Structures are given as structure tokens and as C-alpha cells.
């Protein structure tokens, strides 16, 4: 199978700047009819993909002239002359020359902004949940940038990796930050066998760990 390799995986950009994305194939995607079947699609969250460019450099109907495609053989490039807000999303290259047709892994464009430390909040299990034999400890790590962050749960000083469920939001349209939710689910009994609960975050914005904790009795 022809492998399509896109670089970079994610690209922080500034509105109005010029950006270029790369797509390389493991072998030539030249077709016997003299044409090269390389396409570029754009997919925004929650929507279906939309074709931008086909046959390497042909612009699909309605696509702005700021989008341009070039390349030949195994190296292809998509260029956006002046990036706009509506251009943000995931870009995928596709080859339709050799069966099975394949897609690249995608390149995600996000807005670049200043770093921001997460605002961390920790919540002990609600009274109502405990009465059912369950205990979920929740930690919110809100409005931070960049997206790279490591969250660890420490119970009585010991790291707990089992029972942890994480979820992240997409880049916020208003402040360009990211948010994350981390939930530690235990049994009512397990929860009562310990006292110290810590949600620890490691982020570029702080030398030492960013933490929030609580004790089971207060």
C-alpha cells in the first residue's frame, strides 16, 4: 500500500501569515493516464471533510485563491498565502492513483498565542454518589496553553494510574486555550482507605508541579 506521510502533525499559526504543509508518498503516485491523483481536504470539528485541491494543483469549486498546491512524484505541498480563521482545522492529503487509495495522517492548524498556566480545581465525590457505592474524584485543568500537559493522580503520596479517565476540549474560539478534565473513579470502600488526594499537573508554564489537593476529612 502507498503510505502518505504528512508533516508537521500540528502547526501553531498566526492569522495573516503564510503557511505550507507537506505530504509525501512512499512511492510515485503518477498514473498511466499522465495525471497525478493527489488531493487535499480540510475537515473542521463536527463536520464532514471538504475538498480543497485535486490533481495536485486544481482548485475545487468555491475554494479561495489563497490556497495553492504543488509537487510531483512523491513530494507535495499545500500553501495558504494568508491564513484566515475559517482555515483552521485538520488537513488531509489523499492519493487516488494506486489501489487501495490512502490518506495521510492529517495536519492540524491551531492559533498560536502566549503561554498560559492551567487553573486547577479538584472536587471530592458528591454525597449522593457515595450512597451508591461509587466515588469519583474530579480535577479540572482549565484555560491553558500550549496543549501539552501531563496529569498524575497521587493518593497518600502514591501515584495511581488505574481508574483514570481524561477528556480534552478543542482550542477555545475566544481565548485560544485548551482545557482538560481528569476523573479518578474508585469504590466507596477504596476511597475511605485513603486520606490525601492530589491532582498533579506538569506544564511548561511552571518549574515545579502545579497541584491541588484535599483530605477526606473536612
Amino acid at each position: 500500500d502507498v503510505l502518505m506521510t504528512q508533516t508537521p502533525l500540528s502547526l501553531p499559526v498566526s492569522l495573516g501569515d503564510q503557511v505550507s504543509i507537506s505530504c509525501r508518498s512512499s512511492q510515485s503516485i503518477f498514473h498511466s493516464d499522465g495525471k497525478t491523483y493527489l488531493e487535499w481536504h480540510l475537515q473542521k470539528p463536527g463536520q464532514s471533510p471538504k475538498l480543497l485541491i485535486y490533481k495536485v494543483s486544481k482548485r475545487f469549486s468555491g475554494v479561495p485563491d489563497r490556497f495553492s498546491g504543488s509537487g510531483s512524484g512523491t513530494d507535495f505541498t499545500l500553501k495558504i498565502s494568508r491564513v484566515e480563521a475559517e482555515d483552521l482545522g485538520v488537513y488531509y492529503c489523499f492519493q487516488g492513483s494506486h489501489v487501495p487509495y490512502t490518506f495521510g495522517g492529517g495536519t492540524k492548524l491551531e492559533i498560536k498565542r502566549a503561554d498560559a498556566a492551567p487553573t486547577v480545581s479538584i472536587f471530592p465525590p458528591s454525597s449522593e454518589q457515595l450512597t451508591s457505592g461509587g466515588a469519583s474524584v474530579v480535577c479540572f485543568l482549565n484555560n491553558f496553553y500550549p496543549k501539552d500537559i501531563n496529569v498524575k493522580w497521587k493518593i497518600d503520596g502514591s501515584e495511581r494510574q488505574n481508574g483514570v479517565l481524561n477528556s480534552w476540549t478543542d482550542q477555545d474560539s475566544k481565548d485560544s486555550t485548551y482545557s482538560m478534565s481528569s476523573t479518578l473513579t474508585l469504590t466507596k470502600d477504596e476511597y475511605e482507605r485513603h486520606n490525601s488526594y492530589t491532582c498533579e499537573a506538569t506544564h511548561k508554564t511552571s518549574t515545579s508541579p502545579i497541584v491541588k489537593s484535599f483530605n477526606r476529612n473536612a
Binding site: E39, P49, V99, F103, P124, W168
Partner: protein, 215 residues
């Protein structure tokens, strides 16, 4: 205008089969190929195969040979994809697309394969416990746990509180979904005024309100 309209979301049990429809309008359907694509985890895109409407001839990605069956109904300008012997790995979003003057995409069809039964969510208000800073802003939360199937709609104060809200994508745990939502408000607002998280789950005809009460 050219449009490819797909059938709505499907919830099916493992081992069964399902048919996804792709209705075409605005052009000569019988003359252009219809392709099918699978998108797993809202990321990876995989080409399944295509069908030539006139001849019924098909070309597949070996990986999907046997799993998918492609057909077309010339009279109604509709293409169909049958997925057979469904497994959990078949859960994904499926798209049809054509090769007309470039490529037009259908809106997608979400397929969820599971043995789980409709289950209402348990809604738990999350108020700050033992010390959460006596200063400026306060973050409150709402945990929606153990429901099926998607989706649930979460609002704060019936939609009045929109700014400072973060609702996180649901995660699958023990065959059921769980999601959380946080809201940050000036501490001059809470607990002086009431803050409520409203949860609606259409599938189970559930509508729950949970006030966030101190301690």
C-alpha cells in the same frame, strides 16, 4: 446544487448487519463513481472502496473485503453500503463521496455497535469541598455518569450561564458514557445565587436539574 444525503445515526447490536444510504441529487448519478470512507476515533480516514453505478462493478480495499457490500438503486439515485457481522471495531463515522468535478462528500453517518441498553445518567453536582480558595472566582462542576446512548445536553441555569463554561467530550467506561462540565463564576454570585446544571437525555426521556449546594 450537488448534494449527497446520508441516513441518520445507527445503533446496532454486535453480530447484526446494517445498511447506510447515500442519496444523490443535482447531477447525473449513474455516470459517476461513489466511494465510501471510514473515520475512526474522529481522526484516521480509511478508504473502503467504490462502486460504478452503471455496471455494479466494485473495487475494494482488501481490509474491507467481506465486511462491506456496495450496491446502488439507479431509479432513486441512491447508493448503499451494507456492513455485515458487526463488531465493536466497526463503530465509526462513515462517509460516501463521489468523483464529480472534484469530490463531493456526504454529511456522514455515525454507527455505534454495542450490547448496552438505554440507561439514564446519574447527575452529580460538584461543589468545592475542604478549601478551594476564598478569592475572586469559583469553579463549579457537574458530573454526568453512566448513560447510554449519546448524546446528552448539558446547560447551566437553563442556558443563562454561557460564558466560562467548559463541557468535555464523553468517554466510554464500562460500556457506558461519562462526561463532565465546569462553570466558573464570580464568588459574589455563588453561593449567594443559585447555580444549576441541567441535563437532558432524549433517549431515556430524562430531564434532570441539580443545584450546586455548598459543602
Amino acid at each position: 446544487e450537488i448534494q449527497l444525503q446520508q441516513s441518520g445515526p445507527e445503533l446496532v447490536k454486535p453480530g447484526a448487519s446494517v445498511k447506510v444510504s447515500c442519496k444523490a441529487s443535482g447531477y447525473s448519478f449513474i455516470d459517476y463513481n461513489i466511494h465510501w470512507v471510514k473515520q475512526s476515533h474522529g481522526k484516521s480516514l480509511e478508504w473502503i472502496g467504490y462502486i460504478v453505478p452503471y455496471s455494479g462493478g466494485t473495487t475494494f480495499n482488501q481490509k474491507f473485503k467481506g465486511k462491506a457490500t456496495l450496491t446502488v438503486d439507479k431509479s432513486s439515485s441512491t447508493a448503499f453500503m451494507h456492513l455485515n457481522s458487526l463488531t465493536f471495531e466497526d463503530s465509526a463515522v462513515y462517509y460516501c463521496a463521489n468523483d464529480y468535478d472534484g469530490v463531493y462528500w456526504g454529511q456522514g453517518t455515525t454507527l455505534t455497535v454495542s450490547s448496552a441498553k438505554t440507561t439514564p445518567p446519574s447527575v452529580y453536582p460538584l461543589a468545592p469541598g475542604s478549601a478551594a480558595q476564598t478569592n475572586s472566582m469559583v469553579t463549579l462542576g457537574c458530573l454526568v455518569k453512566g448513560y447510554f446512548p449519546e448524546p446528552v445536553t448539558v446547560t447551566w441555569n437553563s442556558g443563562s450561564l454561557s460564558s466560562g463554561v467548559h463541557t468535555f467530550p464523553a468517554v466510554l467506561q464500562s460500556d457506558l458514557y461519562t462526561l463532565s462540565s465546569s462553570v466558573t463564576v464570580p464568588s459574589s454570585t455563588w453561593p449567594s445565587e443559585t447555580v444549576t446544571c441541567n441535563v437532558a437525555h432524549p433517549a431515556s426521556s430524562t430531564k434532570v436539574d441539580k443545584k450546586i449546594v455548598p459543602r
